[PDB]
Every structure is written in structure tokens, then in C-alpha cells.
Amino acid sequence: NIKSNEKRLRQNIKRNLNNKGQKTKLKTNVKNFHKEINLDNLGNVYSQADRLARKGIISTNRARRLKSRNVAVLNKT
Amino acid sequence: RMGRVHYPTYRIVAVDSRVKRDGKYIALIGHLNPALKENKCKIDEAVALEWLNKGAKPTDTVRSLFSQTGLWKKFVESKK
Amino acid sequence: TKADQEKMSIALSKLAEEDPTFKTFTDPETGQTIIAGMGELHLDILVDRMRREFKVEVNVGAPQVSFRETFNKESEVEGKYIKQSGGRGQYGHVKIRFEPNKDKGFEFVDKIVGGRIPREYIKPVQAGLENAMASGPLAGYPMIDIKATLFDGSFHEVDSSEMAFKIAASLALKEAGKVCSPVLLEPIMAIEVTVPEQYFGDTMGDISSRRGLIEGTEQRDNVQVIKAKVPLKEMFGYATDLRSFSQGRGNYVMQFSHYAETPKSVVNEIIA
Amino acid sequence: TNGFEVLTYIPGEGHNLQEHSVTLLRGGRVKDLPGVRYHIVRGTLDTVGVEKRRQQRSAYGAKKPKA
Amino acid sequence: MKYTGSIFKRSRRLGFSLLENNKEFSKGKKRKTIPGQHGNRFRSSTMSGYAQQLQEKQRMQYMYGITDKQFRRLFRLVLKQRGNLAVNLFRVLESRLDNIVYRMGFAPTRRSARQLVNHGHVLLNDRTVDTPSIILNPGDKVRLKAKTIKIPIVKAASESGVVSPFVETNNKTFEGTYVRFPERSELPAGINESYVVEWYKRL
RNA sequence: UCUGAGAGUUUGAUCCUGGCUCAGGAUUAACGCUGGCGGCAUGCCUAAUACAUGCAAGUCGAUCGAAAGUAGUAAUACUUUAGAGGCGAACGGGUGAGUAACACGUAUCCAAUCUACCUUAUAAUGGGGGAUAACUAGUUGAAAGACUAGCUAAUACCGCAUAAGAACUUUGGUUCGAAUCAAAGUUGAAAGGACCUGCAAGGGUUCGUUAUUUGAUGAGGGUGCGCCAUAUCAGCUAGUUGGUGGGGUAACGGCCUACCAAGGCAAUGACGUGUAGCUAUGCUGAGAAGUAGAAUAGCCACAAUGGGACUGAGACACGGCCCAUACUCCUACGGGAGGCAGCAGUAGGGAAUUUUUCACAAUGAGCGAAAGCUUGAUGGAGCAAUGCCGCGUGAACGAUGAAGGUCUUUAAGAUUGUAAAGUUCUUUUAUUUGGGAAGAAUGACUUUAGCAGGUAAUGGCUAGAGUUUGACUGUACCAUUUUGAAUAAGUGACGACUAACUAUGUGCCAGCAGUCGCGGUAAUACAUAGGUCGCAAGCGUUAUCCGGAUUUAUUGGGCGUAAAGCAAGCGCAGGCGGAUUGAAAAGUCUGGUGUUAAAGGCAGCUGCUUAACAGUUGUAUGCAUUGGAAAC
Fold this sequence. Notes:
- Chain E: One of the primary rRNA binding proteins, it binds directly to 16S rRNA where it nucleates assembly of the body of the 30S subunit.
- Chain E: Part of the 30S ribosomal subunit. Contacts protein S5. The interaction surface between S4 and S5 is involved in control of translational fidelity.
- Chain E: One of its GO terms (biological process) is translation.
- This is part of a larger assembly, with chains A (77 residues), B (80 residues), C (272 residues), D (67 residues) and E (203 residues).
- Chain C has helices spanning 2-18, 39-54, 122-132, 162-180, 200-209, 235-245, 264-267, and strands spanning 24-26, 33-35, 68-70, 79-83, 90-100, 108-110, 146-154, 183-195, 224-231, 252-261.
- Chain C has 272 residues and is α+β, with helices and mostly antiparallel strands.
- Chain C is elongated, with a radius of gyration of 25 Å.
- In chain C, the strands form three sheets. In chain C, strands 3, 8, 9 and 10 form a four-stranded antiparallel beta sheet that branches. Chain C has a four-stranded mixed beta sheet with strand order 4-5-7-6.
- By secondary structure, chain D is mostly loops.
- Chain D is built from no helices and two strands.
- Chain D is globular, with a radius of gyration of 13 Å.
- Chain E folds into two domains: 7-92 and 189-199, Ribosomal protein S4/S9, N-terminal domain (Ribosomal Protein S4 Delta 41, Chain A, domain 1), CATH 1.10.1050.10; 93-184, Structural Genomics Hypothetical 15.5 Kd Protein In mrcA-pckA Intergenic Region, Chain A (Roll), CATH 3.10.290.10.
- Helices cover 35% and strands 7% of the residues of chain E.
- Chain E has eight helices and five strands.
- Chain E has helices spanning 8-14, 49-62, 68-78, 85-94, 97-103, 110-118, 152-157, 193-199; strands at residues 123-124, 127-128, 141-142, 167-170, 175-178.
- In chain E, helix 2 packs across helix 8, helix 4 packs across helix 8 and helix 5 (97-103) packs across helix 6 (110-118).
- The chains hardly touch.
- Chain E binds one RNA strand of 632 nucleotides through helix 1, helix 2, helix 3, helix 6 and strand 2.
């Protein structure tokens, strides 16, 4: 029948918690940038989100879209 | 196998290792009859090069047969 | 229920195929399951193994059996067939004195000396009586080995279709048959019971209550194997009565003796 | 067992049908009665046949011609 | 029937014979009327084109000991190639093994040839043959499996028969060779083959 | 070379309109009688109803700690998995209830899409920290287990730094709604394992990690045309319609949201209702076409019912997760366990469609370097006259017709019938004795020699020999292999429709039948007897679609009296239209190109003793681009 499905049943939960943590810090950086627009916040967002885009949590397409939408308001000054 | 019971058949067919037997594929390279083996096989000798040049290496059970025909010698020229 | 009977038959064929401990009989009287039991517990096991597994609702019935018939020798009957039908003339006038016999079987007697009826019209209506000897005038009880003597008859020269003859044959036979007040003929059997001659009182009393002839014993020089004349109409309950009276120590065997004349206490039960 | 309930004609010499019997119904037509377009094919779960008819034995279910 | 076991009745009803004539040897009356008992003045009840077409069909089929469904199969294979199919049907029918076996003078009757072949008494192309349903090809021989060459019937009937002009044989070694296709004007026949062609409407 | 069969029936008779049946093939087929044999093919059409039990996808120790064993004071060589971690479980396998709609089929575009793993080259494989399972300990219990503290390891996790190239924004090259190419700012990489040469030195070799660059693969997305019926379904619709800003999807988009604005589709049939898996195709027809969409193959659909979400490149997942609902099972009643429309199998239904089977030998898949392991995919076996096909129940001599039936009913004679009695020959099959192959030279393993960027070597590739893998099978086949015709016939009809006739019984009765209709004292039409014919190991019986059938007529029909011209008229839209010239060519005609899968129809060839079959060689309408022709 099946012998190792519970392995994946318990494997993903901790990985999912880690990915939730990464997503939460990403959203925190995005909110910090949204509070006021300046170069340092965008650089922090880059440095803390490119690592997330490296791995399989958020695809690079969404990362590119997010940074383009941020640099738009950055250039709207 | 395909064909007839106690008289098997397997066409040498270009396909990628994704689906089952007798389904979607790309090209029809040829055929081999194991019911009478005398070092002979239906091979186009040209299209198989195109099949090999786009990945999707053939079934593992035909490597000796292709070496007998003389396809590996001209295929390994890329890695030379 | 009929579907209940169908699924019961389907289950009992398999049960007989799997556990041979009883037989099954189906007679053309009305359609009844004559089953082989060992007390009431056997049939309780039957119904339990049927309803708990096959999901069947069923209620057992009472033993239903028939009796033969023989009525008084009449004098004359008046069979008339009057109707304008069939695209022609339909007629028939039959007068038969009907005589039952117990020596031989059926035989037809022609007392039409003057030839007022054609010979070619006799053989069918003969068969009509032979086709009416299966159903009497009361309920259809078997009329067996009865003689017919056509005393008088008349027909129409260009009319009186042949079938009407036999059609009339059952008609008049009913009317006088109602008057004849027939007496029954019960199947009398012999019961051989081996007994250690220590519980014979209950057995003998039950046999006497079952309308039998007992005035002593006949022993096989060490054990008494009594033979008793019995009517079939009450022996079914008598089976378990004897079983319980002797604590199941004495069994018997059933054999077909013959058919014997019935008393009035049987014929008063012929109809409701 | 389905919804509609219909008439049928009994073929063969004699019959074995008194009442309340399960049997096999087959398509057909008889040109003597109104609306009777069914045949009770003999040699079924309950009804027996015209034991004799050796000329026609596929219908009127009967055994082989007598040895 | 593949093995009727009674051919004289068919011969008397049809007035024909597989051989020239040997089915009337005066063992009693020699009557060319129909067998059975139906009156010697009656002929039939329906004599339309259907009746004669069927009569010729049965004649041709029972002259070869073949079943009707295999005949229809043969007709279906005949429809593959085209030409003069009227004589082509005869040519293909004669290509059956037992037909040429008689044409070789091996055995007088196709039934005897079938009995010989089925029991494994014939060799062809170094393979044992047990059926006469072989489509013979031009340029093929037939051996006799010399173990079974000791059959008295074939030895006696080798010389006392007639050899067809489209076949050859070295009867001394009892091996024959197919030369060419048979012809209508060289074999004894008077069958209206057009009736045979028209009758079968399955195709 | 190829493309079309009729007949019967309403009337005293005849013609005509019109209807019905028979003469034809066939299946996911059944029933009754039977009954040798092989190959091939096929086997829930109904209840997407429940389902007992076992089996249905696992793998990696040459990834890691922990734990046992064989022998060895210790180191160790090997087999294992409870666990962590990695890959794969998203495939393969079935089932057709919903879905009448870009779902399918078809040609296409993604200036809107990801593509791990396979192919190509390349920047490279730097350095630390903290972790937790198993285990140890304590409660609870019948196990079940769970809960609570302690210790550990990596290719698990999280940081530190370096980047060709990428990503992001400014400047300049640059395009048939967007994209090329330069300089700059910004920013993000990991992880080792096995082996060899070396005393250590380092280096190399194999797997593999990370950023790339390549194609290919697979999936997604919208449109053209085609693709059931119904008018006894007239209006349907409100995220419905559109602009702006934001969010979000893998990307594009009322996909979602805030404001604003009010159409879209329809009589050319929306919308509602009924039915339905679509396609290649099976069958029939010469064809236009009709019918059903069983195997088989592609697509979507669902996985007890309905909602969600995590996981991972790939799911909202046939046998992952949560919940609700219905159902069901166990329990020492504390609480748990479950979904055969996977394979057989059971219940029920139905008239009805298989054994609770042997192995991965061939193929594929997953992992692994490999010895290899799992494979209810698969290859087989078996049942099932379910179909197709070959194949038998012998063959040759042998009467004025053996006996006898039957008939002639009147005998004289015919018939059964060369069939038999009898003679000869022979053993497919049968029974016995032996030999007994192919399907597999496929993959590795080991010894040889060579090749390659290369070295001191070891590893990858090719050539050679040996080891072996066969469930099937005591198969096939054959053999002074024994015996002997021996072990092997049915089923329908016999008035005409359409082939073959007589007697007896039966008296509008029993009874027949697809049609005409027979039977009221002679039935060729009932029952039966003899004989005969039509098929055949099958024969007939009913149901389905087709042909017959121009009986829905484009092919290929009509509207005076047989059904049918509206009661007449005005007319919207539609359809159809005077002559000459021009232009392009909207169709059409006609080329090239790419697309109409495989299997299948059709033609040739080849091996199955041979046909059945299988394989192969070609062929097949339609679509779009492109150039000609301008008669319509």
C-alpha cells in the first residue's frame, strides 16, 4: 500500500513554518517601504527578498513585479 | 509489448520519457523484430540523430543494437 | 409471498447443496414445500439461517393434502346445450347414468342402440369426461377409475358443434354431481413403530386418537414392532406428538398402504 | 419488474401455467387479439414445454428426439 | 457437410459426378431420377432463376467438398484481384491441394486425398501438411514423405488415372510440380459460372 | 478496371397515391436444442450501490546519527531498517454521473506563459552558527500510543563574503501594443560524498550541489470555422458591461478590490428545458449520408458527497492534509480506524457476460555507481461456442436393391441404399515411450586490447570471450512411440412469399404464423411418421442500427380530383435579380509549402503448414500561407 507518506506528512509542516517566517519578514520590509519611500528601505527589501527569490518559496516573477512596483513610487519623487 | 501474443513487437519510436507505451510521441525511427534476430533492424540512421540531439535518449535496451548498427560512434562525436 | 417463495427456493437449493440433512418435495396439489424436519427446532434453524443471512420474511404453513372422490350411483341426468353462437347452430342433449367402480379403471359404454348420435361425435366427449375426471363438482378432488355409460343422447343434424358435447359433459356432471353428495377416499397408510415396550401406552393412545385399529402388540421376539393403520390427514402433528411421548426414543417409517373409505366426520369438512 | 405490465400469448399444445409463476417474456406479435405483442417462451425458470415436439425444438422447449 | 459419407444421393439428384461416371454400377436399378420418395413424375415446386442458381451453386460446391462459409471467404479474397473472375474462381478453387492431388493421379477422389493429407501422409516445402486449404503458388513442388509411400491405393492409382495438362509429375518418385493455371476448355465442366457469380450477394 | 436485383398485400377485375412485412449484413449481445479441435479476438450496456480479507509506489547506507548480527582483544569487512534527509509518489490503472461549453476536433497566436529532472557551453564548487528526530528518562494503557525533560549529525536549516552572467532603475544604440545593445547604481552562491596517486604535500578522477546559458519536453492561456433536439422555451443578465488606481495569478485580463460610467447578447433562436463523454473510427450504403461512439489510442471530467488549503517544478491530488455531511467498522466504551468508478472477489439488480491465479523472462517507470529492489502496468495461465478462422466424426471395393421402416395404401414393386453386411488402407484427434528448441545473446559482472581532454594512477566509450537470467512448457515440432475406424452430428424448413412432398390421427376443436392466411368430416399450411432439402460444430429465436426505402427526395418527391397552395392583401429583414466596361480577387479553378497522430479503411509485399492474423511499403478528404486565371 503505502509506507513512507507520513514522512512527507510531518516533513512539510516545519518547512511551511519556515516559509511563513520568510514571507512575514518580506511583508514587514514591504510595509516599512510603504510607510515612506527612500533608497535604504528599497535596498533592505532587495537584500532580504532576493534570498527568498533564490529558493522555492516565491517565484522570481512576483519578486520582479514587486520591485518594479516599488521603484515606480521611488521614481515618483 | 505490442502486436501479437507469442509474436511480440516494439517499434523504434522517438519519444520523451514522460508517458506510457503506445501514446504521444514525436517521430517513428524504425522497428526491430526480436522474433527473428540476425543482426538486422529497421533504422533510418538520419532522424535518430535529430532525436538524440534534442535529448530524450532512447530506451536502455537498444544501446547494444545501436552500437551494432553504428550509431553510437557517430553520436559521441559531439562530446569529442 | 411468491417472491419470498422464489428466493426461498434459491436459498434452499444451495442449502441442500451444502448441508445434506433433509429433503425437499414439491407436489402439484397446490404448490407446497414438504420439508424433512427433526422437531420444531429443525424448521426454526431453517428460518433463522434464511432470514438472518438472505433477508427473507416467511411464515410456515399447515400440512395441506387432498382426498379422492366417489359419489352415489345416480339414475338420470339432463344435460342441455342451448345457444345461438359460433356462426352456426349449437346444441347437445346428454343423459348419462354415471357409475363409479373399484375393480378396474375407466371404460366407456355406448347405450345408443338406434344411432341417434353419430359415432364420430362420441370419442371427443369421452375424452371430455377423461378431461373432467381430474376436477369434480365440489373442489376438483381426484376422480380415479370411474366408468361412464352414455345411456341416451341427441344432437342437431346440421348443427350441434362437437365441442359443445364435451362442453356440456362437465355441465350436467356438475349439477347431478352436486345432488350426488360424494363421499371421500382417504389415503390410509401403515406405520411401523419399534418400541422397547415401556412407553407404548402414550403411543397406543395417540394412535387410537388418530382413528386407528389397535388391540394388542406384535413383537419381533425381543422388541415390539407394531403396525398401525393411519389416515394421512393428521399424521404430520402425530410425528412430533409420538416423538415427545417416547422422549424421541422411538422412530418410524412411512409407507403407502392404499386408499380407504372415509367416515362422515371427514366428509363434513370437505367444504367450508 | 419495471413499470409497465402487459399481456402475452401462450404457445404450444397444452400449458403449464396456472397462476403466480415467474417466466420469460420475449418480443413478438400475434394477430388474433388486440394489443398482444409478446410471447411467453417456454423452457424457462418455471414453465416446462410440449415434451414431444421434435420438429420444432428450439422453440417450445423440449429434449432431443427420442432415442 | 465437410465429410458427407453419402455422395450417391447427391449424384442421383443432380445427375452429375465428381469422376467421369462411376456412381451407377447397376447394383440394382440404375435410375437417374431424384433419390428418396417424391414421385417419379414430379420435378420441383419452384423453378425460377433462384432455383437454378442455387442448383448450380450446390453442384459446384459439392464437386469440391467445400463448406459455404469458406466459399464466401474465397470469394472475398477473389474480389481483391481483378480480371475475368468467372474463370478465376475456377482457377483458384482448383489450386486447392486435393484438387491438384487428383490432377496428379495420386488419388481418385478429393475425399480420399483429404484423408491422406490430414493424417500426415504428404510433405510440401519440407513442412508437414494436414489441410488442403493451401493457396498453391506457381513454382511449387510436393513430396510424399517416403515413409508413407507404401500406401497401396496411391501406388495402384498412379498409373490408372489421367494427368491434367497444366501439371507435371515424376510419378516414379511420386512427386509432382505445378506448371501453370488451369483452363476452362481443358477440364470437364459445363457449369454456368455466371450464376455462381451473381447468386452470392454478401458482397 | 471500378459504381444501383426484387416480391407480397386494400378492390368482381384493373390503374394510381400511400403504409407494413419478407429476400442483406452486424454487434459490449441472450434464450432452447445440442456439441471434436487449434489460433486470433472479446467478455457489467443496467446500480458512479455498499463493499469482508490479502495484494496494488516505493527507493537511496557509495547521504547521516542511532541499533543488531556474522568472525576479529580494539580497529574493522559486510546484511538490515525504526528515524532524519534526498528523489519519486502530480506517473501508470480504471470509470463515464454531471458538463450542450473554446470542453472536445481543427488551423493558429502567446510584443502575455513556467518548464526540476535529459541535451549545449559557462561563472563555480569559500567560510561559520544554531538546530531536532531515533535514543535516555518520567505518566497512561490490553496493546495502542501520545504527552513531558536531556543529548546528538549531515547533501536538513539559518547567517558571514566573493561574482562572469542574471534581476532591478538613469544615460545612449534601437521595433511590426512592445524589443534589441552600451556605461552606471543595486543585489543575491552553495555541500559535500566515493576513489586514486602520493610518508605527510597537493592534485586528479566519479556522483552531486549553486548561479547560469542552450534547445527539446510537457503544461497553461484567447480567438477563426465546424461541432444534439426543443418556439407547447421572448426577452436573459447583474461583476453583468467599460475607464481609471491598487492587489493578485506562472503570466494577460472585473480575476479581486475603491471610485466613476450603463450596456452586452438576442427572432440569423439568447435564455430555459430534455438528452449526451468528445475524436480517429466500428457497422451499413456505390455515394452523398445514417447509426453507435465496446475494445485500442488523445483530451477533459470526477475519486463516498461538498468545501478549502499545505507540499513540491508540476495537485487543489484514484489509495496526501483539515473541516462539514451521509454511511460504515472496532473497542477493556477511555477513544479510534475506513472509503475496490486499482486486480481478482462478494452482496443486489438485471435475461446476462470470467479465477477471491503464476512472475517481473520481454518492455516501461522510481531510486541507486552498481549486485539490485517495488511494479494487480505488464507478460502469462484459466474460465467463458462470445465472435472469426482452419480443422475432424475416416477413405477406396462391395445387390436388379440384406432385414426392416415408409410408401405403392390394390400385394405385384419402389424407397431408405454403397449408406449398410462384409473386404482393404490409414491414424488429424485419441493412448502410451523419448528427444525436446525459439521467445534473451537483451543488462550487468570478470578477465583482454584500444580511444579520448589526462595522469603517477583511477575512472567514462568502443571491440573480444566466459557467467548466467524462460513464469510460460512434459508448449510447438518430430521421433521402428503402442493400439485400433476406432474416441467423436446437430439444427430449421418442405402451400406461395424464398428450396425441397406423401401417408396417418385431428373435424372452426385441439391447434398454427414475419406476410398472404389454413383447419365446419381429403389439412401437402395443425400433431405425428417416412423421405427430402438450407446451414453447420454450430443451427435456429426474439432487440437494437443500416440496406431494401428517392419512406424527409442537394444527390433523388410533390401540392386540380388521393394527405398537401395559407381567405385575400400591404409590406420590415432575408433570398434571388436588365446590359457594357474597369479594378482587385470575397468564393471558385489551379500550383508549392506546413498541418490532417498511432493503430484502423483500401492496394502490394513478408512470416506464421495455410487461410484467420500481425508487420511493412504507400494512399485518404480538411485547414492556413504563398503565386497565377478573371468566365461566373
